[PDB]
Amino acid sequence: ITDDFTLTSPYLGFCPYCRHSAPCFSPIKIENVWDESDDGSIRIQVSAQFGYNQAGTADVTKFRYMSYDHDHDIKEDSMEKLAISTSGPCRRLGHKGYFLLAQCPPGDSVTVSITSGASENSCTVEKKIRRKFVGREEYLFPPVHGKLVKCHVYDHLKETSAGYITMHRPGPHAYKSYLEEASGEVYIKPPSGKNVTYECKCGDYSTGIVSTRTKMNGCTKAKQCIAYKRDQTKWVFNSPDLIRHTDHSVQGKLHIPFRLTPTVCPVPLAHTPTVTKWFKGITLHLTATRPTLLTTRKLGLRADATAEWITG
Amino acid sequence: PPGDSVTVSITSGASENSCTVEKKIRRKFVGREEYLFPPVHGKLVKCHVYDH
Amino acid sequence: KFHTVVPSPQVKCCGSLECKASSKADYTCRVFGGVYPFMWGGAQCFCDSENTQLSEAYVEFAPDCTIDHAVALKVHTAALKVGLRIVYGNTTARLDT
Amino acid sequence: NPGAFGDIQASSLDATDIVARTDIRLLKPSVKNIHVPYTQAVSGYEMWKNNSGRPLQETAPFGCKIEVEPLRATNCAYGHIPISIDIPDAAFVRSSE
Amino acid sequence: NPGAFGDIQASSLDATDIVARTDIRLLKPSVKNIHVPYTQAVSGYEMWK
Numbered sequence: 001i002t003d004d005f006t007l008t009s010p011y012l013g014f015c016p017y018c019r020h021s022a023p024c025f026s027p028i029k030i031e032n033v034w035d036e037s038d039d040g041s042i043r044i045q046v047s048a049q050f051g052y053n054q055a056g057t058a059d060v061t062k063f064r065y066m067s068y069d070h071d072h073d074i075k076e077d078s079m080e081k082l083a084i085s086t087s088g089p090c091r092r093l094g095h096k097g098y099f100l101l102a103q104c105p106p107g108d109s110v111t112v113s114i115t116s117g118a119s120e121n122s123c124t125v126e127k128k129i130r131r132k133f134v135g136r137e138e139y140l141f142p143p144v145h146g147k148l149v150k151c152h153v154y155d156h157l158k159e160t161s162a163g164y165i166t167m168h169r170p171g172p173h174a175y176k177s178y179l180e181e182a183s184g185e186v187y188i189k190p191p192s193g194k195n196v197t198y199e200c201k202c203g204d205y206s207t208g209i210v211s212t213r214t215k216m217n218g219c220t221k222a223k224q225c226i227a228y229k230r231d232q233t234k235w236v237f238n239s240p241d242l243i244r245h246t247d248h249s250v251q252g253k254l255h256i257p258f259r260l261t262p263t264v265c266p267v268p269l270a271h272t273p274t275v276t277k278w279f280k281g282i283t284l285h286l287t288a289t290r291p292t293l294l295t296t297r298k299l300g301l302r303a304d305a306t307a308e309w310i311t312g
Numbered sequence: 313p314p315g316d317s318v319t320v321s322i323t324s325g326a327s328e329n330s331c332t333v334e335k336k337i338r339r340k341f342v343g344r345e346e347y348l349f350p351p352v353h354g355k356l357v358k359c360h361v362y363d364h
Numbered sequence: 365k366f367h368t369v370v371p372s373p374q375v376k377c378c379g380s381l382e383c384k385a386s387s388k389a390d391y392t393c394r395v396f397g398g399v400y401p402f403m404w405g406g407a408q409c410f411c412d413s414e415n416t417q418l419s420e421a422y423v424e425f426a427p428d429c430t431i432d433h434a435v436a437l438k439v440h441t442a443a444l445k446v447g448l449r450i451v452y453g454n455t456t457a458r459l460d461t
Numbered sequence: 462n463p464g465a466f467g468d469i470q471a472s473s474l475d476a477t478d479i480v481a482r483t484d485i486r487l488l489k490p491s492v493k494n495i496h497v498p499y500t501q502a503v504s505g506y507e508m509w510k511n512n513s514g515r516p517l518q519e520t521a522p523f524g525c526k527i528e529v530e531p532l533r534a535t536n537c538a539y540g541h542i543p544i545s546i547d548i549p550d551a552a553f554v555r556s557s558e
Numbered sequence: 559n560p561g562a563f564g565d566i567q568a569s570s571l572d573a574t575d576i577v578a579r580t581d582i583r584l585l586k587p588s589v590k591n592i593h594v595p596y597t598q599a600v601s602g603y604e605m606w607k
């Protein structure tokens with residue numbers, strides 16, 4: 001098994017949301033998210049790829065390029081034009097493989113957008129995003145002073161030691177422009193400089209291999225006939241939006257960058273309380289500027305445990 | 313998007329001229345559960361909207 | 365926490381298929397017919413009845429599980445270990461038993 | 462049980478063998494666009510997390526201090542213990558002395 | 559009384575003399591960065607408001 005980048009290529013997907021608020025096809029399709037890191041950062045998938053050069057271009061890696069496919073083939077562009085937002089701008093943290101790591105504010109949905117210099121292409125997905133903090137009071141921003149405690153977060157290092165993903169070749173790609181009924185019979189084009197395979201169900205299973213040649217078949221109706229712009233040269237990550245090739249064979253894998261690791265994080269030491277003196281008891285004076293957890297338990301048989309949240 | 317007031321602005325190339333008015337704007341959806349964004353799959357039902 | 369799997373579907377252009385079996389956890393399959401799937405290059409295949417689509421689904425532990433995992437434990441037979449300091453005639457001893 | 466704690470099991474964190482049941486029934490394909498509409502119940506892990514209850518650390522009697530890697534308690538006091546003690550006669554001192 | 563109305567007093571709005579008591583206990587310096595971590599109870603003025 002390998003971790004290279006040349007053997008992989010991006011692919012097209014179906015986003016429920018597009019720049020026109022109509023579910024449609026985009027090459028920036030995403031499938032899921034992960035936000036278990038205590039820092040609030042997020043790891044995001046995508047059909048496309050960046051942090052490398054165009055998948056298939058001589059350069060395996062160029063951090064200024066984003067790999068995507070459109071029209072008939074893969075293309076290049078500067079990754080700088082990319083942006084992320086859920087309720088506002090998101091600061092980039094790192095990128096590798098198909099995957100991106102970045103921090104966003106609280107929100108109810110996430111979106112990734114990019115301008116091709118002439119149009120805005122974006123994809124939105126739904127996700128519950130809150131500000132989960134470690135400790136006993138949900139603070140707002142970490143203080144300079146406090147106690148240092150164990151925590152788990154995603155490391156900004158491009159290298160990783162977690163996860164696993166499948167990779168294999170795709171199914172055929174059917175292009176409508178390859179099929180024409182302009183002629184009384186079936187007219188198709190590979191087109192020039194290709195090796196197309198085409199199929200037709202009229203009568204029986206009819207197949208035809210044509211390279212740089214327009215060809216005809218008996219059944220004049222060009223609709224039932226089917227053609228492929230097939231290349232079968234690149235491995236892709238399994239996605240629901242893509243048909244399974246008849247091979248259905250696991251051919252390779254890849255890692256997931258930016259794994260989760262333990263580390264040390266600071267937390268506030270809230271205003272400690274003033275203690276009174278009470279007959280067979282005690283009365284307290286708690287002070288806080290934020291919700292904070294408190295509790296106590298007896299030290300004998302009956303635990304008599306109690307807990308509470310205090311705001312002010 | 314949802315909001316409590318609307319505004320229209322324009323730059324004349326040297327200054328910003330804009331007008332704001334007050335209006336309650338929410339995300340009203342048809343059906344029986346107020347969704348968030350329409351799904352790819354579901355049931356097709358009558359609705360009323362402004363034609364573009 | 366678990367992550368589902370939605371593998372690339374098994375679509376037979378103008379033919380037939382079935383619902384096989386597998387050992388994957390929560391593995392399920394289901395088939396339909398008379399389907400016209402489409403795609404950016406156009407419609408890949410259409411056959412009013414002969415087209416068939418087969419989908420399958422399973423699940424696996426999420427990659428982050430490696431650290432977010434919880435475990436179920438069966439416990440029994442509580443046993444005690446005690447550390448003692450014993451001084452006799454300015455003769456100290458630290459013991460554990 | 463779908464929607465219940467421990468919906469997914471594994472003898473090891475990375476064991477190939479896995480078993481679960483969370484009410485995954487497939488859905489018919491939608492209009493004209495190839496995809497896999499699916500359905501399944503939320504993970505019991507997150508549900509139990511939202512309502513797991515408070516840790517035993519804040520409920521054990523006698524002020525137990527509990528740690529995980531030995532799954533043990535410490536400095537938790539209750540009851541009485543008999544003890545038998547043997548002593549060298551050298552440590553003893555003659556009365557006249 | 560800390561956290562209570564009238565925690566700060568003055569015979570005049572600009573009188574130099576002033577007296578208060580609001581439970582200000584200083585905190586030990588933090589890690590490697592010079593600063594003054596402090597602590598004190600909210601103003602009774604805003605609470606009473």
Ligand SMILES: *[C@@H]1O[C@H](CO)[C@@H](O)[C@H](O)[C@H]1NC(C)=O
Binds near residue numbers: 211
């Ligand atoms: C198509 O592929 C065949 C087999 O590799 C080859 O002989 C033929 O020259 C190719 N035609 C092209 C690339 O136009």
Ligand SMILES: *[C@@H]1O[C@H](CO)[C@@H](O)[C@H](O)[C@H]1NC(C)=O
Binds near residue numbers: 453
């Ligand atoms: C313990 O006490 C005895 C007398 O009672 C004395 O001789 C001996 O030196 C003492 N030992 C120590 C370690 O102080």
